[PDB]
Design a protein around this nucleic acid. Structure first.
Ligand SMILES: [Mg+2]
Ligand SMILES: [Mg+2]
Length: 757
DNA sequence: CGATCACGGGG
DNA sequence: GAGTACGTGATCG
């Protein structure tokens, strides 16, 4: 009867057991299923071949792996009936061990659905959807503070504070005496970590909210717990938090709970040049949050002075993490429900994967064999594919800019023109739609797999919107608002998904055709805007920016709002143009490279700011000054003078060496590097002096004056002697400051050579 | 040139 | 864990 919050599998006597984690009227419940079997499909040249194929074996865990059962099944592949063999295996881990040995067989045409994780395969095949119902979950935010010194190995310093927050308040656990009402003083780091364990086990939250807990709080807690020889039984089955390598980074799971890391969530939802907790909190709640930096924390801890400030910082970190979690969780819960996969997985995935997860479930429901993910070569061939058929933007600084969004136009185009990989250039097709300019043909004889699903999504959203108008219950209304927004997000991701290189249902011709049909409406919007005195400053497939040159801002807003209302009255069906926002000033460099400033003075950029540790402060500071001179002062001449002054100061050795430090992490043992960059050259010298260089250590260096590649001229920041060493002014000018500002100033007709005296 | 390698968030 | 993240820009070899 309960709400499914997660699913996984355990192995018992070498056999897999599925676990379904549920919340039923406030109670945690686990259901176990020992009956679900792993499988793959094999398309054979002939039915006689099954006798050779069913006899294929592999090895795993010292035992030989066999196909347990085979079953001839009738399915659909690319809108055509197909006969494949369902090959059953005992354990999920048998699938990577045997799949290549089945694929290699001369009688095997191809294999299918050989990389779907067991718990995700279970939820699809059994028709189970997470987050259904009105079941109320409990939340706890968790955060930590540590003792850090520049360039230390990860986990060297102790955890000095652990903070948590829920509706009962925000609290701090520390092992140094601080006299504040929300601070619990314990005897040691060990006792503080054990107190966190107790809080989590006693509060028993369904959701543990963190800010970058995947890649900091939890790996750090695990490192220090290992060090101190203590366990972290945070799982509802008493298991420890589990670190999963998700790409080049990490993801942490806590069994029986939802580890909700806000960092990947917020990074997708909103646009910010830097997603610090303080920048994120202000963007959403319109309130400032003070940042207490690592060096200030270390100084207060070691000296024992100003610890009240550090404890307040730790408390506020947990407090706002709780507040942000409550804000961002409902939408992730509805997306999980819509796509039919747990929030843990859905909150950490791109919209492209959300679409694919939705499609894999619908393919099962429709008996449609899923196409395979591409191999490296295909993935690479897809990235190099050229699309025919979005001009260069207007130069200079523009005032009073309206932003219009086109994204809600594309699902309707996909549906009306039956744009799908299964309908593309079909043989013996009776009726078809021809894409303008690109000429791709889409069969009209049957609804395509993707248009069919999109149509149902848009219909469901219209029902939800109608139920919302007719509802008196504000609780149902709030919930229905989240559900209709989840459909809008998923439906507006299909256009992009067609061109997503990793997509199973990738279709270059589909994406191209949606673009070509879409363009007819964009050209109509542009002509209608220009007939109304508007100048289009920037236009791409997602939207445009426009202004009425020299008009009053309120007149621009009114005319734009009146235009959107008008055009939508002209557009058929669910084709919708949206007024996104207004900006006091802005400039446009190229496709998805631009900067704006709103009426409250907040700078908004896309594809231009360089806030990262592997760029020197002098380059990042100059870039901020250039954007401020342009957007806040409306003065490109001031911006050019700033660059010219900084470059001359660098030439005359007038810039502090501290603004010239470059930081780069060591990501593997030093011997595993194939290319030795400056930070590796610096690292190798440190290791030679006896420094324990380890992956995760961040190397700070300065590029000195001299001959050859910068690798041979980089010096460790701790070894830099201003009275002896001379930094490379030409490197900091040509490779740091000038690349940071040259893109920006190209929009104003400046080349890299005009930004020096 | 192609290949290799780094960034983000968090102390 | 029957998945891996991404997109982009600098520097090395
Ligand atoms: Mg999981
Ligand atoms: Mg903190």
């Amino acid at each position: 009867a309960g709400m499914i919050i997660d699913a996984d599998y355990i192995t018992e006597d070498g056999k897999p057991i599925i676990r379904i984690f549920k919340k039923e009227k406030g109670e945690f419940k686990v259901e176990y299923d020992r009956t679900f079997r792993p499988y793959i499909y094999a398309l054979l040249k002939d039915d006689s071949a099954i006798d050779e194929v069913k006899k294929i074996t592999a090895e795993r865990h010292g035992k030989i792996v066999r196909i347990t059962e085979v079953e001839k099944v009738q399915k659909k592949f690319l809108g055509r009936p197909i006969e494949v063999w369902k090959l059953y295996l005992e354990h999920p881990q048998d699938v990577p061990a045997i799949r290549e040995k089945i694929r290699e067989h001369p009688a095997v045409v191809d294999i299918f659905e050989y990389d779907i994780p067991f718990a995700k395969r279970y939820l699809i095949d059994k028709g189970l959807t997470p987050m259904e119902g009105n079941e109320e979950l409990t939340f706890l935010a968790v955060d930590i503070e540590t003792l850090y010194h520049e360039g230390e190995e990860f986990g060297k310093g102790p955890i000095i504070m652990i903070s948590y927050a829920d509706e009962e308040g925000a609290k701090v656990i520390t092992w140094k005496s601080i006299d504040l009402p929300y601070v619990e003083v314990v005897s040691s780091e060990r006792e503080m970590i054990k107190r966190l364990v107790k809080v989590i086990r006693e509060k028993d939250p369904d959701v543990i909210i963190t800010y970058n807990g995947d890649n900091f709080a939890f790996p750090y807690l695990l490192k220090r717990a290992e060090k101190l020889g203590i366990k972290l039984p945070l799982g509802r089955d008493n298991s420890e938090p589990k670190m999963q390598r998700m790409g080049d980074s990490l993801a942490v799971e806590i069994k029986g709970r939802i580890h909700f890391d806000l960092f990947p969530v917020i990074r997708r939802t909103i646009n910010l040049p830097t997603y610090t907790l303080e920048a994120v909190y202000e963007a959403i709640f319109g309130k400032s949050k003070e940042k207490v930096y690592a060096h200030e924390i270390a100084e207060a801890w070691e000296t024992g002075k100003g610890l009240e400030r550090v404890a307040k910082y730790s408390m506020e970190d947990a407090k706002v993490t709780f507040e942000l979690g409550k804000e961002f969780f409902p939408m992730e819960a509805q997306l999980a429900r819509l796509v039919g996969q747990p929030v843990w997985d859905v909150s950490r995935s791109s919209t492209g994967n959300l679409v694919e997860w939705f499609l894999l479930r619908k393919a099962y429901e429709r008996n449609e064999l899923a196409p395979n993910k591409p191999d490296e070569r295909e993935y690479e061939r897809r990235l190099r594919e050229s699309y025919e058929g979005v001009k260069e933007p207007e130069k200079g600084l523009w005032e009073g800019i309206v932003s219009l969004d086109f994204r809600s136009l594309y699902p309707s185009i996909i549906i009306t023109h039956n744009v799908s990989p299964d309908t593309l250039n079909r043989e013996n097709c009776k009726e078809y739609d021809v894409a303008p300019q690109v000429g791709h043909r889409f069969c009209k004889d049957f609804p395509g797999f993707i248009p069919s699903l999109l149509g149902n999504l848009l219909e469901e959203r219209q029902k939800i919107k109608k139920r919302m108008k007719e509802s008196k219950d504000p609780v149902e209304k709030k919930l229905l608002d989240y559900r209709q927004r989840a459909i809008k997000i998923l439906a507006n991701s299909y256009y992009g998904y067609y061109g997503y290189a990793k997509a199973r249902w990738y279709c270059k011709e589909c994406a191209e055709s949606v673009t070509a049909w879409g363009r007819q409406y964009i050209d109509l919007v542009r002509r209608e805007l220009e007939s109304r005195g508007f100048k289009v400053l920037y236009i791409d497939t997602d939207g445009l920016y426009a202004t009425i040159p020299g008009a009053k801002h309120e007149e621009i807003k009114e005319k734009a709002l009146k235009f959107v209302e008008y055009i939508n009255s002209k557009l058929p069906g669910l084709l919708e143009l949206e007024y996104e926002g207004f900006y006091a000033r802005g400039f446009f460099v190229t496709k998805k490279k631009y900067a704006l400033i709103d009426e409250e003075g907040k700078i908004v950029t896309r594809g231009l700011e360089i806030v990262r540790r592997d760029w020197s402060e002098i380059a990042k500071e100059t870039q901020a000054k250039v954007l401020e001179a342009i957007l806040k002062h409306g003065n490109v001449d001031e911006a050019v003078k700033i660059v010219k002054e900084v470059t001359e100061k660098l030439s005359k050795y007038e810039i502090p060496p501290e603004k010239l430090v470059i930081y780069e992490q060591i990501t593997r043992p030093l011997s595993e590097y194939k290319a030795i960059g400056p930070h590796v050259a610096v690292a190798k010298r440190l290791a030679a002096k006896g420094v324990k260089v380890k992956p995760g250590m961040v190397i700070g260096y300065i590029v000195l004056r001299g001959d050859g590649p910068i690798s041979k001229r980089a010096i460790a920041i701790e070894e830099f002697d201003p009275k002896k060493h001379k930094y490379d002014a030409e490197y900091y000018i040509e490779n740091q400051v000038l690349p940071a500002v040259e893109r920006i100033l190209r929009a104003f007709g400046y080349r890299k050579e005009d930004l020096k005296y």
